[model samples]
Target: FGDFLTVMTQKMSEKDTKEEILKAFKLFDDDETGKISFKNLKRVAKELGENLTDEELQEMIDEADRDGDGEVSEQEFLRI
Candidate 1:
């Protein structure tokens, strides 16, 4: 669904879907927010000392948001 799998791909695949995206999002969103906002993702990256633009962040998320339900789950995610 995108040019890249995702930062949270676990290096196991070259693509992502809602299923995998949701799992990854939850890892950063400890509140069960159902979706990862730009703020949380940015904060996480800052804590890791890594820099990423909003566009980059959204694109990664978009890759996993197959249905765009505002979240992703491993089942909806895929590698191809």
Candidate 2:
């Protein structure tokens, strides 16, 4: 029922969500750079069978790269 779905969603707090996000971020953050770079994102996308172009990937970086370092750090990622 809708009530069951709502109850399940309500069980996770912001902290829990951030932890889950960090875990997924680490998967894409190869080389332990503490950030998600274009190369890293590309590799993950390819592995996941995502047929995105370089421009599309770069756009993703631009959206999340708040510090403009051409990558998404843990802080920047969490903000999204």
Candidate 3:
């Protein structure tokens, strides 16, 4: 699954993903954090000129946090 995801991300997109978006996700990673917190998620989205409502934001996380932990992995970010 990890290998498959890696290959999928090599061509990532706003088809729900983007190359720069993954780079941005790493900024919030801050030390192999393995997941992005809700705090950083919003801040990053705001930096990208996105102003999603709380419900929208929550929905995104809920969709991508595949482990159901309210935190997203890089793969999950790409998947989103």
Candidate 4:
């Protein structure tokens, strides 16, 4: 959920736009579950210019999903 948000905060550093964020989220939420699995969430990170590996992606999910639900909720997204 939370990784450094500078890429999201600084418009100039953002590799994707606001619309792109929404679009990417939809793309990652393949099952229409309104949340994403750690595996798919990496797409947003990579597209956002983070280039995270599978292990890093797992860590991101593990650290953020404090509820241990195996999904990244919007609230969890803010925690980052």
Compared to the true structure, candidate 2 yields what TM-score?
Answer: 0.62
Descending-lDDT candidate ranking: 2, 3, 4, 1
Per-structure clash totals for the candidates = 9, 0, 1, 1
Off by over 4 Å in 3: 1-22, 74-80
Candidate 1 lDDT over 1-80, as tens digits, reads: 23332342335465445564444545666876455555676776556443667787777666666665645544444332
What TM-score fits each model? Answer: 0.48, 0.62, 0.54, 0.50
lDDT of 1: 0.53
- What lDDT would each prediction earn against the true structure? 0.53, 0.57, 0.57, 0.57
Q: Which candidate would rank higher by TM-score, 1 or 3?
A: 3
lDDT of 1 at 38: 56
Candidate 3 has its poorest 10 consecutive residues by lDDT at 1-10
Candidate 3, 30-67: lDDT as tens digits: 77766776776566556554355666566666756676
- Model 2: per-residue Cα lDDT over 1-80, one tens digit each: 12212232353332342355566676666677777678876666566532467776676677667675777776775564
Q: 69 in model 1: Cα distance from truth in Å?
A: 3.2
TM-score of 1: 0.48
- Error (Å) of candidate 1 at residue 35 is 3.2
**By the lDDT metric, which is better: model 1 or model 3?**
3
